Design a binder for these strands. Structure first.
Ligand SMILES: Nc1ncnc2c1ncn2[C@@H]1O[C@H](CSCC[C@H](N)C(=O)O)[C@@H](O)[C@H]1O
Length: 327
DNA sequence: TGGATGCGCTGAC
DNA sequence: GTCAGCGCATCC
């Protein structure tokens, strides 16, 4: 993540729905916001959350009375995506996990915050012939909010990862916010290579598979793009190797394959998957962030998480707007 | 709501 | 035909 000298969100309270690792909290708190509530039902996620912010998130959002939720200015919710993901079976709102946005909606209807900051995968924007994005949109509008949604690739904001996600920013209409803009992209100057830990700390992650079929030659110059170099097995998910001279591929939560959840990489003549700390770094997390003691759980958490930096800029712009109160 | 991993197949070139 | 995906299925 980056530092924010002008705390645009000072004075604003927010809530961390579907908390996870607390990505939205890190991003918003870096702008001065104060977290007044967090909700997450996963045990292990609650542990690492607690481990980094003290409090333990409340459970099942569907069993919480919106009226219980403390008052706030911004609602942060990066709801589930398996049901909207391109690799999932896209059952959408017909997935027991695809209806969480309606819980978010019933919390907004009641707590009427100034802003609703949401995040879900890229395929969410075009899922079910863009009918899904529209529901989320028309729902928000019906709730008397403006709907600003765009798909942003982390690689365009300083993080070497091709993580495309839809960010939906909503302002309560009485605020008449008319100048919100998504961060403008910039040149990437960091790649997988710059975030790796010393070889001495990742030998265990080394994978020597007799069925490695190096499909391409390693690249000399860095690039703001994923560069596949080889394959293991049938080269499905978790069976692809990339150049550390490029950017990393999207981290996943339930990912399989031998290079499960992070993908494989060619590092100093050897092939291995990323280490939890490297997953943190590739997600914009500061090295001060305490990752979960269970590496499997930690991989699942970073795969489900968000790229802080991207959230930071969007957050800076949300406040930058809220603050424009000319006479 | 455990950990590991082989795989299907849809989406946007 | 290419290739990447906050995933899914099945095993211990
Ligand atoms: N009914 C429910 N109640 C509370 N949390 C839920 C939930 N259903 C799913 N979740 C949580 O929703 C999260 C979605 S992934 C979001 C992660 C978050 N942005 C962070 O930065 O990492 C998961 O951690 C999942 O356990």
């Amino acid at each position: 993540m980056i530092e924010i000298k002008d705390k645009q969100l000072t004075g604003l309270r927010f809530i961390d729905l579907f908390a996870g690792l607390g990505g939205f909290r890190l991003a918003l708190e870096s702008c001065g916001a104060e977290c007044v509530y967090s909700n997450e039902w996963d045990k292990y996620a609650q542990e690492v959350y607690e481990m980094n912010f003290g409090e333990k998130p409340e459970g099942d959002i569907t069993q919480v009375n919106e009226k219980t939720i403390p008052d706030h200015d911004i609602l942060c919710a990066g709801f589930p995506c398996q049901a909207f993901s391109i690799q999932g079976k896209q059952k959408g709102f017909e997935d027991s996990r695809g209806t969480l946005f309606f819980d978010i909606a019933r919390i907004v209807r009641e707590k009427k915050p100034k802003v609703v900051f949401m995040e879900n995968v890229k395929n969410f924007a075009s899922h079910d012939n863009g009918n899904t994005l529209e529901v989320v949109k028309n729902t928000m509008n019906e709730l008397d909010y403006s709907f600003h949604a765009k798909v942003l690739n982390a690689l365009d904001y300083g993080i070497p990862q091709k993580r495309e996600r839809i960010y939906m920013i909503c302002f309560r209409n009485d605020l008449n916010i008319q100048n919100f803009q998504f961060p403008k992209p910039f040149e990437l100057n960091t790649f997988v290579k710059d975030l790796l830990l010393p070889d001495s700390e990742v030998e265990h992650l080394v994978i020597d598979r007799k069925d490695l079929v190096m499909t391409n030659q390693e690249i000399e110059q860095t690039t703001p793009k994923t560069v596949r170099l080889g394959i293991v097995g049938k080269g499905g998910s978790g069976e692809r190797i990339y150049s550390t001279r490029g950017i990393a591929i999207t981290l996943s939560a339930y990912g399989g394959g031998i290079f499960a959840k992070t993908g494989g990489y060619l590092v100093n003549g050897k092939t291995r998957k990323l280490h939890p700390r490297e997953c943190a770094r590739v997600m914009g997390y500061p090295d001060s962030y305490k990752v979960h003691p269970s590496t499997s759980q930690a991989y699942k958490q970073f795969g489900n998480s968000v790229v802080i930096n991207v959230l930071q800029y969007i957050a800076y712009n949300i406040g930058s707007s809220l603050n424009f109160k000319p006479y």
